[PDB]
Each structure stands twice: as C-alpha cells, then as structure tokens.
C-alpha cells in the first residue's frame, strides 16, 4: 500500500543544568529504525530495526554527522526563539520538528511535510505544494521571511521528493519481511459483571500492524459510540499494537451487541458477539 518515512526531533533547554537535550527518532511506517539521544553514551546514531543493522559504517558516520548538525542547529534555535518571544533564560523550552515523505502503492511520491512547534504548539509548516510556509504567529513570520530568502523550501522539496523516497524504497526492500507485512488483529471478548444487572463487554484487538485500526461497538446495528469506552491504540513493545473498546451492558442483552473491527491486515471487517 502507501508507505511513509518520518523523522521526529525534540529539543529541550536545560537552564544552568547543561546543554539542551536532543532526541532524534526515525520511523518507517509505525516501525522505529534509528535513534540519537544526546544524553546517551555513544554520541552516535544507533539502529532500532534489524534491517538497518547492516548498513555499513559509512552510512552511520553519515547519519551521525548530520544528526549532530541537527542537534547543534536546534541548539541555536532555542536561543533564537527565547529572543523572538522575549523570554527569560531561566525557564525550560521545547523545540519539536517532524519531517518525512509518504509514498503510494506504486512507491511513487505522494506527499511530504516538515513542521516545527515551540513549546508544544505550532510554529511554522511547509504547505502541500512544498514551497510555501505557514507561520502561526509573528515570530514564525520572521522565520518564514528568512527561509523564503534562502530558498529553504526548494532544497526541502528536493529531499522530500527524492532522497527521502529513494531511501524509503531502500528501507522497504531491505526490511521487506518486516515493513511490507500486515498482521491482522487477533481478537476476542471478555465479560465482567459490574453488578447483578450489568455486565461489561470488552472487545480486544491484539498484536496488529500497522497501528491504524477501528473498533466500534453496536447494538442491534446502532453504533454505541457514546457509551463506548475506548483506549488509545498502544504499543505491545514487539513491533505490534493493541486496543480495546468496552461497553457496559444489561445482563440478558449480551446478544444484542456486536464488536466490529477493521484493519489493513483483514480481508473482511471482523464481527464479534458474546455468543
């Protein structure tokens, strides 16, 4: 199907307690394959997927060298924004950045994105056309003029439309066994008495990939979406995800309720009853 490669960068200031912390992670789809932590011993980019382990030193030295640059850049960046926002050099602040590309079923470019956020809030973002920026406030406007100046977005488009897709396809072929799979949800239900007259039906989707899934409860066909408890899709820790939705049902009506599960690794949306 479609695939994606994305890099996430976080950067938090540590007023007086040393350099700013810097954490870079990189995913293909919902699978992490590299990391760099400024507080980790190695001070190198490290792998996290099996398929990237054998990439050669040249590739590692490259990625480390360029992640270190990102690190140092965000170091300056923290300083810039404390200025723009007229803030004290006493408090801690966060710079977050995410960029990557999506590819379609044909493995041809689909879209690209590149966004910043100061203190957990939108700052500036590349637009669909990969040439125009969206400044969220006045300081972001300044950066926008600065970047339109250096033709920033022309160079980005060239990474996102080429290098990025070029490399995503490489990864996808190297980690074929892993990235190109889809695990269908292994589902089941549990029943617990909330009281003498009430039971809780809980619908489980275990061990699936990718994370995207849909769990709905229904009663005689009518979506119970408002009386349904539904937790965030969560990582199992093994490269698969879990999720459940619960409804509180009147004893004696277990039969009127269905759980419907839809995933990419499923040919036909499962339907589960307590029956």
């Amino acid at each position: 199907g479609s695939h994606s490669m994305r890099y996430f960068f976080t950067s938090v200031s540590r007023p007086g307690r040393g350099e700013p912390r810097f954490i870079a992670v990189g995913y293909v789809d919902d699978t992490q394959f590299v990391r760099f932590d400024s507080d980790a011993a190695s001070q190198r980019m490290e792998p996290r997927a099996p398929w990237i382990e054998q990439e050669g030193p040249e590739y590692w030295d490259g990625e480390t060298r360029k992640v270190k640059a990102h690190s140092q850049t965000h170091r300056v960046d923290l300083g810039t924004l404390r200025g723009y926002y007229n803030q004290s050099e006493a408090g801690s602040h966060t710079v977050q950045r995410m960029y990557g590309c999506d590819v379609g079923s044909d493995w041809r470019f689909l879209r690209g994105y590149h966004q910043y956020a100061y203190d957990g809030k939108d700052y500036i973002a590349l637009k669909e056309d990969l040439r125009s920026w969206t400044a969220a406030d006045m300081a972001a406007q300044t950066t926008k003029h600065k970047w339109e100046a250096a033709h920033v977005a022309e160079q980005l488009r060239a990474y996102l439309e080429g290098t990025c897709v070029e490399w995503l396809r490489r990864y996808l072929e190297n980690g074929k066994e892993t990235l190109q799979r889809t695990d269908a949800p292994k589902t089941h239900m549990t029943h617990h008495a909330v009281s003498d007259h009430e039971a809780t039906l809980r619908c489980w989707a275990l061990s699936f990939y990718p994370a995207e899934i849909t769990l709905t409860w229904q009663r005689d066909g009518e979506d119970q979406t408002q009386d349904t408890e539904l937790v965030e899709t969560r990582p199992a820790g093994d490269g698969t995800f879990q999720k459940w939705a619960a409804v509180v049902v009147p004893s004696g009506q277990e039969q009127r309720y269905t759980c419907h599960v839809q995933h990419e690794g499923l040919p036909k949306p499962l339907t589960l009853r307590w029956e």
Partner: peptide, 9 residues
C-alpha cells in the same frame, strides 16, 4: 536517511 540541510529558525 536523514536530511543534510542545516536549518535555523
């Protein structure tokens, strides 16, 4: 593969 461009705000 990461991006090579230094990019300052």
């Amino acid at each position: 593969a990461m991006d090579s461009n230094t990019l300052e705000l």
